[PDB]
Nucleic acid binder design. Structure first.
Ligand SMILES: [Mg+2]
Ligand SMILES: [Mg+2]
Ligand SMILES: [Mg+2]
Ligand SMILES: [Mg+2]
Ligand SMILES: [Mg+2]
Ligand SMILES: [Mg+2]
Ligand SMILES: [Mg+2]
Ligand SMILES: [Mg+2]
Ligand SMILES: [Mg+2]
Ligand SMILES: [Mg+2]
Ligand SMILES: [Mg+2]
Ligand SMILES: [Mg+2]
Ligand SMILES: [Mg+2]
Ligand SMILES: [Mg+2]
Ligand SMILES: [Mg+2]
Ligand SMILES: [Mg+2]
Ligand SMILES: [Mg+2]
Ligand SMILES: [Mg+2]
Ligand SMILES: [Mg+2]
Ligand SMILES: [Mg+2]
Ligand SMILES: [Mg+2]
Ligand SMILES: [Mg+2]
Ligand SMILES: [Mg+2]
Ligand SMILES: [Mg+2]
Ligand SMILES: [Mg+2]
Ligand SMILES: [Mg+2]
Ligand SMILES: [Mg+2]
Ligand SMILES: [Mg+2]
Ligand SMILES: [Mg+2]
Ligand SMILES: [Mg+2]
Ligand SMILES: [Mg+2]
Ligand SMILES: [Mg+2]
Ligand SMILES: [Mg+2]
Ligand SMILES: [Mg+2]
Ligand SMILES: [Mg+2]
Ligand SMILES: [Mg+2]
Ligand SMILES: [Mg+2]
Ligand SMILES: [Mg+2]
Ligand SMILES: [Mg+2]
Ligand SMILES: [Mg+2]
Ligand SMILES: [Mg+2]
Ligand SMILES: [Mg+2]
Ligand SMILES: [Mg+2]
Ligand SMILES: [Mg+2]
Ligand SMILES: [Mg+2]
Ligand SMILES: [Mg+2]
Ligand SMILES: [Mg+2]
Ligand SMILES: [Mg+2]
Ligand SMILES: [Mg+2]
Ligand SMILES: [Mg+2]
Ligand SMILES: [Mg+2]
Ligand SMILES: [Mg+2]
Ligand SMILES: [Mg+2]
Ligand SMILES: [Mg+2]
Ligand SMILES: [Mg+2]
Ligand SMILES: [Mg+2]
Ligand SMILES: [Mg+2]
Ligand SMILES: [Mg+2]
Ligand SMILES: [Mg+2]
Ligand SMILES: [Mg+2]
Ligand SMILES: [Mg+2]
Ligand SMILES: [Mg+2]
Ligand SMILES: [Mg+2]
Ligand SMILES: [Mg+2]
Ligand SMILES: [Mg+2]
Ligand SMILES: [Mg+2]
Ligand SMILES: [Mg+2]
Ligand SMILES: [Mg+2]
Ligand SMILES: [Mg+2]
Ligand SMILES: [Mg+2]
Ligand SMILES: [Mg+2]
Ligand SMILES: [Mg+2]
Ligand SMILES: [Mg+2]
Ligand SMILES: [Mg+2]
Ligand SMILES: [Mg+2]
Ligand SMILES: [Mg+2]
Ligand SMILES: [Mg+2]
Ligand SMILES: [Mg+2]
Ligand SMILES: [Mg+2]
Ligand SMILES: [Mg+2]
Ligand SMILES: [Mg+2]
Ligand SMILES: [Mg+2]
Ligand SMILES: [Mg+2]
Ligand SMILES: [Mg+2]
Ligand SMILES: [Mg+2]
Ligand SMILES: [Mg+2]
Ligand SMILES: [Mg+2]
Ligand SMILES: [Mg+2]
Ligand SMILES: [Mg+2]
Ligand SMILES: [Mg+2]
Ligand SMILES: [Mg+2]
Ligand SMILES: [Mg+2]
Ligand SMILES: [Mg+2]
Ligand SMILES: [Mg+2]
Ligand SMILES: [Mg+2]
Ligand SMILES: [Mg+2]
Ligand SMILES: [Mg+2]
Ligand SMILES: [Mg+2]
Ligand SMILES: [Mg+2]
Ligand SMILES: [Mg+2]
Ligand SMILES: [Mg+2]
Ligand SMILES: [Mg+2]
Ligand SMILES: [Mg+2]
Ligand SMILES: [Mg+2]
Ligand SMILES: [Mg+2]
Ligand SMILES: [Mg+2]
Ligand SMILES: [Mg+2]
Ligand SMILES: [Mg+2]
Ligand SMILES: [Mg+2]
Ligand SMILES: [Mg+2]
Ligand SMILES: [Mg+2]
Ligand SMILES: [Mg+2]
Ligand SMILES: [Mg+2]
Ligand SMILES: [Mg+2]
Ligand SMILES: [Mg+2]
Ligand SMILES: [Mg+2]
Ligand SMILES: [Mg+2]
Ligand SMILES: [Mg+2]
Ligand SMILES: [Mg+2]
Ligand SMILES: [Mg+2]
Ligand SMILES: [Mg+2]
Ligand SMILES: [Mg+2]
Ligand SMILES: [Mg+2]
Ligand SMILES: [Mg+2]
Ligand SMILES: [Mg+2]
Ligand SMILES: [Mg+2]
Ligand SMILES: [Mg+2]
Ligand SMILES: [Mg+2]
Ligand SMILES: [Mg+2]
Ligand SMILES: [Mg+2]
Ligand SMILES: [Mg+2]
Ligand SMILES: [Mg+2]
Ligand SMILES: [Mg+2]
Ligand SMILES: [Mg+2]
Ligand SMILES: [Mg+2]
Ligand SMILES: [Mg+2]
Ligand SMILES: [Mg+2]
Ligand SMILES: [Mg+2]
Ligand SMILES: [Mg+2]
Ligand SMILES: [Mg+2]
Ligand SMILES: [Mg+2]
Ligand SMILES: [Mg+2]
Ligand SMILES: [Mg+2]
Ligand SMILES: [Mg+2]
Ligand SMILES: [Mg+2]
Ligand SMILES: [Mg+2]
Ligand SMILES: [Mg+2]
Ligand SMILES: [Mg+2]
Ligand SMILES: [Mg+2]
Ligand SMILES: [Mg+2]
Ligand SMILES: [Mg+2]
Ligand SMILES: [Mg+2]
Ligand SMILES: [Mg+2]
Ligand SMILES: [Mg+2]
Ligand SMILES: [Mg+2]
Ligand SMILES: [Mg+2]
Ligand SMILES: [Mg+2]
Ligand SMILES: [Mg+2]
Ligand SMILES: [Mg+2]
Ligand SMILES: [Mg+2]
Ligand SMILES: [Mg+2]
Ligand SMILES: [Mg+2]
Ligand SMILES: [Mg+2]
Ligand SMILES: [Mg+2]
Ligand SMILES: [Mg+2]
Ligand SMILES: [Mg+2]
Ligand SMILES: [Mg+2]
Ligand SMILES: [Mg+2]
Ligand SMILES: [Mg+2]
Ligand SMILES: [Mg+2]
Ligand SMILES: [Mg+2]
Ligand SMILES: [Mg+2]
Ligand SMILES: [Mg+2]
Ligand SMILES: [Mg+2]
Ligand SMILES: [Mg+2]
Ligand SMILES: [Mg+2]
Ligand SMILES: [Mg+2]
Ligand SMILES: [Mg+2]
Ligand SMILES: [Mg+2]
Ligand SMILES: [Mg+2]
Ligand SMILES: [Mg+2]
Ligand SMILES: [Mg+2]
Ligand SMILES: [Mg+2]
Ligand SMILES: [Mg+2]
Ligand SMILES: [Mg+2]
Ligand SMILES: [Mg+2]
Ligand SMILES: [Mg+2]
Ligand SMILES: [Mg+2]
Ligand SMILES: [Mg+2]
Ligand SMILES: [Mg+2]
Ligand SMILES: [Mg+2]
Ligand SMILES: [Mg+2]
Ligand SMILES: [Mg+2]
Ligand SMILES: [Mg+2]
Ligand SMILES: [Mg+2]
Ligand SMILES: [Mg+2]
Ligand SMILES: [Mg+2]
Ligand SMILES: [Mg+2]
Ligand SMILES: [Mg+2]
Ligand SMILES: [Mg+2]
Ligand SMILES: [Mg+2]
Ligand SMILES: [Mg+2]
Ligand SMILES: [Mg+2]
Ligand SMILES: [Mg+2]
Ligand SMILES: [Mg+2]
Ligand SMILES: [Mg+2]
Ligand SMILES: [Mg+2]
Ligand SMILES: [Mg+2]
Ligand SMILES: [Mg+2]
Ligand SMILES: [Mg+2]
Ligand SMILES: [Mg+2]
Ligand SMILES: [Mg+2]
Ligand SMILES: [Mg+2]
Ligand SMILES: [Mg+2]
Ligand SMILES: [Mg+2]
Ligand SMILES: [Mg+2]
Ligand SMILES: [Mg+2]
Ligand SMILES: [Mg+2]
Ligand SMILES: [Mg+2]
Ligand SMILES: [Mg+2]
Ligand SMILES: [Mg+2]
Ligand SMILES: [Mg+2]
Ligand SMILES: [Mg+2]
Ligand SMILES: [Mg+2]
Ligand SMILES: [Mg+2]
Ligand SMILES: [Mg+2]
Ligand SMILES: [Mg+2]
Ligand SMILES: [Zn+2]
Lengths: 116, 59, 48, 118, 112
RNA sequence: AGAUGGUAAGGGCCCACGGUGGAUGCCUCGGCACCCGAGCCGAUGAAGGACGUGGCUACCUGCGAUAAGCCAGGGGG
RNA sequence: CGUGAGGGAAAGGUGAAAAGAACCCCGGGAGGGGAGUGAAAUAGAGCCUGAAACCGUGGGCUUACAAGCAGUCACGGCCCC
RNA sequence: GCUGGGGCUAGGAGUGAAAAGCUAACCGAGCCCGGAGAUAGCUGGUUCUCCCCGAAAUGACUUUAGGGUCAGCCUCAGGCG
RNA sequence: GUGGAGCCUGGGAGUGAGGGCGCGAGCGAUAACGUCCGCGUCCGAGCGCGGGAACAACCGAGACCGCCAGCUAAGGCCCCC
RNA sequence: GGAUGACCCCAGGCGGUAGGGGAGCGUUCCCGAUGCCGAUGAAGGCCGACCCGCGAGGGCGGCUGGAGGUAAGGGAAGUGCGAAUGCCGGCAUGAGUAACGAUAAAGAGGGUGAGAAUCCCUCUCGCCGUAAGCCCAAGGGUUCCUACGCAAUGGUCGUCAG
């Protein structure tokens, strides 16, 4: 019996081309160029999935640092303080506190200054 | 010469950017003061045969 | 310039013609072959 | 450059362009009105105006002058006897050019009429 | 209500007619007629016919009024191409495409 | 002094609908393989053809100046 | 195609049935628009299905101080459910 | 001397006032078909997915050195422990 | 010392152009991103991740997947960052 | 752990080229099939932000389509393409670009026609004239003449034409 391509390859290509919607020029219209683009895309996602965690901690730290210096001390001093104090609220929530609930953030700063 | 050649196929975008100047300008037309038909200025009216007040031509 | 094809009915008939083919063992084989292939022309057609 | 140069070339060599104006002259003096392309038309005016002006001189010398371009004795007789008198009091400008509104199909050339004034 | 005309297999290259069609899209039937009449292009003759046929259809089949018709939509699609041999130097042979257009004109009524 | 919006000649992404093109599925008057049957024709001019042949007939098919056919037996309705 | 021996293609599908679109309208014709046929006419003969590259028309978002393997991650604006 | 028509000589053969020139637009050995799917230790190419492991570019010999045979190094199965 | 240790018998291989760096030599000129051996290492195959401006093999470190959580490594903490 | 493949718990491994091994997906065909799904719509096509699967895939839904498709479990292979200056075809880019084939040359008026720089007629102009005129022979094979045509052929046009 003979088993020609038939329906199979077209279906495989549509898969890829659907994934490449939005891409520029032939990158969304040509199977070959789409496929190459998705390789790149796949690694970027993985890598940036990783870097998103870094990227946000960076933002938090910058933001905490700004709110610290308002009370006359820097980020390094603040964090060491909180360590001596036994306060384990992470920078995600610290940064939130710094903006949304400044009275509470002031308190944490005090504890920090005192713990040393 | 040594037979220059396109190094890369021109993108749909770039070929259409080239053509951004290719639109036709519509014909400039004015009413013939005699038969009110539309025709280009400074031409003998091709519908009634009048120009500068007088009949010049057999239409 | 003078090209390679210079038509000549006599030349054509005497060289590739039916009678020429029959004359020789190889030529008869040419005819046999073209008949087995089912050629519509065993021999170059030419007008006189 | 072309700085202050007079006279179209009309994509003809020297003797062709000459023949061109002469032949148009014959046609114009003959039928009173011809149709041509706009450039040939503007260029015809002066060439013919001069011929009419000489026929207004009427003398032998002038007839023999005109004959050099027009070549046809009868047509020149028409020029002197019928055409030129119309212009006895007219001071130049014996020809007019008016542009037609439609272009030639086969090449899009703009056309104009050249006629003798009244 | 709309009225349409199509000229299929017109032996002109689409890129060229489209230029002309672009001139009359969205124009009044009257302005379109004037435009086409003094558009120095081969294409103008073909567009004009499709325009005029659609106008006919409008008035005659679709109960629309001539004095209210306008070019609501128009477009040129590519038809099948006629491939022809163009002999070049050194024994080489090229292929000219003598191209083909499908011209559409759709009229609507500019009400009021 | 400062600040921020509407421009699209044209381009890009997405959606709808067309054009072009002829993949895919289905289809089969054709192929392929094996097996069985069968197996020479020709001077009584073969094989293979040329040219003809129809009321109107390009080609194919059939036929041979008795030319899409003549005679007789058989089949069939 | 080749002087020749010889080389050697491409090219299938309307519909159950031609019922293969009378007649009118624009057009020189081609083509189309109505009428009509059909279960179906984007089955209309350039005819089953009708993918893709490719070309176009309409709409949404976007773009004329900006640096690129064209993506990816985040956030905000606008449009839709 | 040039030229028309009619002829003859060809593939390791012809013909050549000799250039390995010419023998139907590529001649240090014409073209077609066949042997034939020659041979190619060379270059290219080799098509769904997931999971475990995971090298070598060294030694010996080799008309061998950009190829091989054996060993080394990887893997799987049974067995020993 | 219980390890993707080790041994034995079999099945399947691939490899038999390496390269940088460190240390020990020879050749070279106490030259070469030079060449040739020895021990090790990485790249090869970790052109995956951090550092080194950028950069296979230098420093840090062996990436099963996910998280808008925490601690460190080299290197850093004036602004780009 | 419990009965042994149910699931659960504790722990450890899980970068990877040449390459070894394991488990799967899908395509064509055969048994299953005198069956079953199917015009209340087969296959194929186009969507899908839905479901299942690590994945290859499998469902389900809407549109298209108009007559086929075939389960559980097995069997057999022309069984999966992105590259081979691959093969066949289709369509792009260069691009409205080079070119439109001797620089002997054109102009006007009249006519025909839906349409004319290009067809017919007239006048003017220019080119060959040991030819670019005429007559034979090769070779070509109806190209000759006339009517009726302009889709293609004609390097543009065409009402004209080999
Ligand atoms: Mg089959
Ligand atoms: Mg297959
Ligand atoms: Mg295949
Ligand atoms: Mg896409
Ligand atoms: Mg996008
Ligand atoms: Mg692209
Ligand atoms: Mg596309
Ligand atoms: Mg990837
Ligand atoms: Mg991650
Ligand atoms: Mg996180
Ligand atoms: Mg981290
Ligand atoms: Mg952020
Ligand atoms: Mg401070
Ligand atoms: Mg700490
Ligand atoms: Mg902390
Ligand atoms: Mg607030
Ligand atoms: Mg040169
Ligand atoms: Mg490009
Ligand atoms: Mg290009
Ligand atoms: Mg491209
Ligand atoms: Mg370009
Ligand atoms: Mg576009
Ligand atoms: Mg451009
Ligand atoms: Mg006036
Ligand atoms: Mg010569
Ligand atoms: Mg010759
Ligand atoms: Mg000679
Ligand atoms: Mg020939
Ligand atoms: Mg030839
Ligand atoms: Mg001869
Ligand atoms: Mg001769
Ligand atoms: Mg002869
Ligand atoms: Mg002879
Ligand atoms: Mg003979
Ligand atoms: Mg023999
Ligand atoms: Mg012979
Ligand atoms: Mg035959
Ligand atoms: Mg023969
Ligand atoms: Mg014969
Ligand atoms: Mg003869
Ligand atoms: Mg100059
Ligand atoms: Mg001046
Ligand atoms: Mg001037
Ligand atoms: Mg002058
Ligand atoms: Mg000028
Ligand atoms: Mg001129
Ligand atoms: Mg010039
Ligand atoms: Mg000229
Ligand atoms: Mg001269
Ligand atoms: Mg007159
Ligand atoms: Mg003067
Ligand atoms: Mg003179
Ligand atoms: Mg003169
Ligand atoms: Mg004008
Ligand atoms: Mg004008
Ligand atoms: Mg005009
Ligand atoms: Mg033209
Ligand atoms: Mg145009
Ligand atoms: Mg456009
Ligand atoms: Mg215009
Ligand atoms: Mg009307
Ligand atoms: Mg040429
Ligand atoms: Mg030639
Ligand atoms: Mg091309
Ligand atoms: Mg072409
Ligand atoms: Mg075309
Ligand atoms: Mg603004
Ligand atoms: Mg804007
Ligand atoms: Mg815009
Ligand atoms: Mg615009
Ligand atoms: Mg479509
Ligand atoms: Mg489409
Ligand atoms: Mg089947
Ligand atoms: Mg059969
Ligand atoms: Mg006998
Ligand atoms: Mg016989
Ligand atoms: Mg017959
Ligand atoms: Mg009988
Ligand atoms: Mg009987
Ligand atoms: Mg022949
Ligand atoms: Mg077909
Ligand atoms: Mg049928
Ligand atoms: Mg049928
Ligand atoms: Mg009709
Ligand atoms: Mg009519
Ligand atoms: Mg009519
Ligand atoms: Mg006609
Ligand atoms: Mg019709
Ligand atoms: Mg109709
Ligand atoms: Mg009905
Ligand atoms: Mg029904
Ligand atoms: Mg219809
Ligand atoms: Mg449909
Ligand atoms: Mg249908
Ligand atoms: Mg089709
Ligand atoms: Mg069917
Ligand atoms: Mg169809
Ligand atoms: Mg279609
Ligand atoms: Mg598109
Ligand atoms: Mg758009
Ligand atoms: Mg600036
Ligand atoms: Mg801006
Ligand atoms: Mg930018
Ligand atoms: Mg970049
Ligand atoms: Mg970005
Ligand atoms: Mg002699
Ligand atoms: Mg002789
Ligand atoms: Mg000779
Ligand atoms: Mg001879
Ligand atoms: Mg030989
Ligand atoms: Mg021989
Ligand atoms: Mg031989
Ligand atoms: Mg010899
Ligand atoms: Mg000699
Ligand atoms: Mg030959
Ligand atoms: Mg030769
Ligand atoms: Mg040899
Ligand atoms: Mg030869
Ligand atoms: Mg043979
Ligand atoms: Mg052999
Ligand atoms: Mg062979
Ligand atoms: Mg050999
Ligand atoms: Mg081989
Ligand atoms: Mg491992
Ligand atoms: Mg070795
Ligand atoms: Mg060594
Ligand atoms: Mg030896
Ligand atoms: Mg060697
Ligand atoms: Mg070698
Ligand atoms: Mg070797
Ligand atoms: Mg070995
Ligand atoms: Mg071992
Ligand atoms: Mg072993
Ligand atoms: Mg074991
Ligand atoms: Mg191991
Ligand atoms: Mg081991
Ligand atoms: Mg063990
Ligand atoms: Mg194996
Ligand atoms: Mg090896
Ligand atoms: Mg070796
Ligand atoms: Mg080496
Ligand atoms: Mg070695
Ligand atoms: Mg090593
Ligand atoms: Mg070494
Ligand atoms: Mg070495
Ligand atoms: Mg040291
Ligand atoms: Mg030293
Ligand atoms: Mg070295
Ligand atoms: Mg060194
Ligand atoms: Mg050294
Ligand atoms: Mg070592
Ligand atoms: Mg080493
Ligand atoms: Mg390697
Ligand atoms: Mg490694
Ligand atoms: Mg390692
Ligand atoms: Mg690199
Ligand atoms: Mg690295
Ligand atoms: Mg690094
Ligand atoms: Mg770095
Ligand atoms: Mg390096
Ligand atoms: Mg791990
Ligand atoms: Mg810390
Ligand atoms: Mg440190
Ligand atoms: Mg900072
Ligand atoms: Mg685990
Ligand atoms: Mg593991
Ligand atoms: Mg690990
Ligand atoms: Mg692994
Ligand atoms: Mg295994
Ligand atoms: Mg399954
Ligand atoms: Mg498959
Ligand atoms: Mg059955
Ligand atoms: Mg069945
Ligand atoms: Mg049922
Ligand atoms: Mg039904
Ligand atoms: Mg349905
Ligand atoms: Mg099937
Ligand atoms: Mg299926
Ligand atoms: Mg699916
Ligand atoms: Mg569905
Ligand atoms: Mg339906
Ligand atoms: Mg369906
Ligand atoms: Mg059936
Ligand atoms: Mg069974
Ligand atoms: Mg197999
Ligand atoms: Mg195969
Ligand atoms: Mg590949
Ligand atoms: Mg390919
Ligand atoms: Mg290529
Ligand atoms: Mg190439
Ligand atoms: Mg290339
Ligand atoms: Mg190849
Ligand atoms: Mg191709
Ligand atoms: Mg193109
Ligand atoms: Mg231009
Ligand atoms: Mg250019
Ligand atoms: Mg240019
Ligand atoms: Mg040329
Ligand atoms: Mg040009
Ligand atoms: Mg020419
Ligand atoms: Mg040419
Ligand atoms: Mg020329
Ligand atoms: Mg010229
Ligand atoms: Mg001269
Ligand atoms: Mg000229
Ligand atoms: Mg005329
Ligand atoms: Mg006229
Ligand atoms: Mg009449
Ligand atoms: Mg008339
Ligand atoms: Mg004409
Ligand atoms: Mg015309
Ligand atoms: Mg001419
Ligand atoms: Mg002369
Ligand atoms: Mg003479
Ligand atoms: Mg002479
Ligand atoms: Mg003869
Ligand atoms: Mg001939
Ligand atoms: Mg004929
Ligand atoms: Mg024609
Ligand atoms: Mg025509
Ligand atoms: Mg025509
Ligand atoms: Mg006809
Ligand atoms: Mg033509
Ligand atoms: Mg030509
Ligand atoms: Mg006619
Ligand atoms: Mg005629
Ligand atoms: Mg004739
Ligand atoms: Zn008027």
């Amino acid at each position: 019996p003979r088993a020609k391509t038939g329906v199979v390859r077209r279906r495989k290509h549509k898969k890829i081309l659907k994934l490449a919607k939005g891409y520029w020029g032939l990158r969304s219209k040509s199977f070959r160029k789409a496929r190459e683009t998705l390789f790149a895309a796949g690694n970027y996602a993985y890598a940036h999935r990783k870097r998103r965690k870094r990227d946000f901690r960076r933002l938090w730290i910058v933001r905490i640092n700004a709110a610290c210096r308002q009370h006359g001390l820097n980020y390094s001093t603040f964090i060491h303080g909180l360590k001596k104090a036994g306060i384990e609220v992470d920078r995600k929530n610290l940064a939130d506190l710094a903006v949304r609930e400044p009275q509470v953030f002031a308190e944490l700063v005090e504890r920090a200054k005192a713990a040393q | 010469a040594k037979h220059p050649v396109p190094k890369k196929k021109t993108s749909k975008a770039r070929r259409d950017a080239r053509r951004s100047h290719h639109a036709l300008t519509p014909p400039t037309l004015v009413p013939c003061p005699e038969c009110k038909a539309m025709k280009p200025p400074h031409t003998v009216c091709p519908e009634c045969g009048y120009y500068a007040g007088r009949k010049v031509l057999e239409v | 310039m003078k090209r390679t094809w210079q038509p000549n009915r006599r030349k054509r008939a005497k060289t590739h013609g039916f009678r020429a083919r029959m004359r020789t063992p190889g030529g008869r084989k040419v005819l046999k072959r073209r008949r087995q292939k089912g050629r519509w022309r065993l021999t170059p057609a030419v007008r006189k | 450059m072309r700085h202050l140069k007079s006279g179209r070339k009309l994509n003809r060599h020297s003797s062709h362009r000459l023949a061109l104006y002469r032949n148009q002259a014959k046609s114009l003096l003959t039928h009173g009105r011809i149709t041509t392309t706009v450039p040939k038309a503007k260029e015809l005016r002066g060439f013919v105006d001069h011929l009419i002006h000489l026929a207004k001189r009427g003398d032998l010398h002038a007839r023999r002058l005109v004959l050099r371009d027009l070549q046809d004795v009868k047509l020149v007789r028409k020029l002197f006897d019928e055409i030129a008198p119309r212009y006895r009091d007219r001071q130049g400008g014996y020809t007019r050019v008016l542009k037609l509104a439609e272009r030639r199909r086969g090449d899009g050339a703009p056309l104009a009429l050249v006629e003798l004034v009244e | 209500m709309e009225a349409k005309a199509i000229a299929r297999y017109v032996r002109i290259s689409p890129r060229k007619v489209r230029l002309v069609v672009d001139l009359i899209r969205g124009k009044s039937l009257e302005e379109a007629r004037n435009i086409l009449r003094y558009t120095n292009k081969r294409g103008a003759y073909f567009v004009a016919k499709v325009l005029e046929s659609a106008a006919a259809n409008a008035v005659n089949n679709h109960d629309m009024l001539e004095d209210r018709l306008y070019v609501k939509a128009a477009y040129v699609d590519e038809g099948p191409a006629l491939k022809r041999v163009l002999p070049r130097a050194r024994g080489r042979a090229d292929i000219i495409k003598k191209r083909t257009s499908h011209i559409t004109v759709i009229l609507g009524e500019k009400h009021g």
